[PDB]
Symmetry: C3
Subunit: 114 residues, 3 copies
């Protein structure tokens, strides 16, 4: 799957190993190898919830088919605390959205060429 | 509603108070209280279109639940975007998306 | 057409005239004039991909028209080398996905309203 984190928290505040930690956590929850897991953390964003520019994060999880619904709740219970504590963000200012990816959409590896 | 602005304008020249201003404008346009509004501005992008790397902004509004609506939204937001970010109006675009109720945003306050 | 490049490569590491070059390559690839090409490079992301935080580029091309394998292949042949060489990324860490744009999704220009 692909986990994306948009946040207004400064780049320097993102702890070292946080990417590896997210990857390991997703790999733990899914039983899927770290090899096919992708994670994007985008800091230094200009964001506001309700006009408030306090530390916050809008996150999106993209997986094949639909390992969600209740697994959405599961994923939330798995990721929310980690995000909130690592990024110094209040839990009520972290949002996670879940999307279904199209399995038939083929990603092209450039090593076949170039 | 969530409003996203992708721009190649440097973060420093994004006016202080622009997020609040955008929030209130969206509150008027959508008719929803600011608490339900999220604004996401992405500066310092490398962007080009129309054969030019001049200042520009590609924006998107995502909300739960029409062309007329999109038009009125554009009328309400365009001037603010163009003037505040110092971008020529013809280099500001806005797309509108109806958000699928399955699924919306899950807040983490309930969980850990 | 709209080409998006998500990369962990620093913004300062992106060579002068890269957007112009990409625009020309994309216009040759899509057979549309350069003026119709849109390019969005999103650098300085914190990306782990395949369990690695080494330089990488996850790209997407959005264009109106049916998604075809041969066309995607030709696109990749045209784009991969340019991306890898210009951004100094290993070709096996550059990926391109191809998406069919919804023609009924109208982009509103603000010159009409400002
Ligand atoms: Cl502000
Ligand atoms: Cl009409
Ligand atoms: Cl070919």
């Amino acid at each position: 799957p692909m986990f994306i984190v948009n946040t207004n928290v400064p780049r320097a505040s993102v702890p070292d190993g946080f990417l590896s930690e997210l990857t390991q956590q997703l790999a733990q929850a899914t039983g899927k190898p770290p090899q096919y897991i992708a994670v994007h953390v985008v800091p230094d964003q200009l964001m506001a919830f309700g006009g408030s520019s306090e530390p916050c994060a809008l996150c999106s999880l993209h997986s094949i088919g639909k390992i969600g619904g209740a697994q959405n709740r599961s994923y939330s219970k798995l990721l929310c605390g980690l995000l909130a504590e690592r990024l110094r963000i209040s839990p009520d200012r972290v949002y996670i959205n879940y999307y279904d990816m199209n399995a038939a959409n083929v990603g092209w590896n450039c090593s076949t060429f170039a």
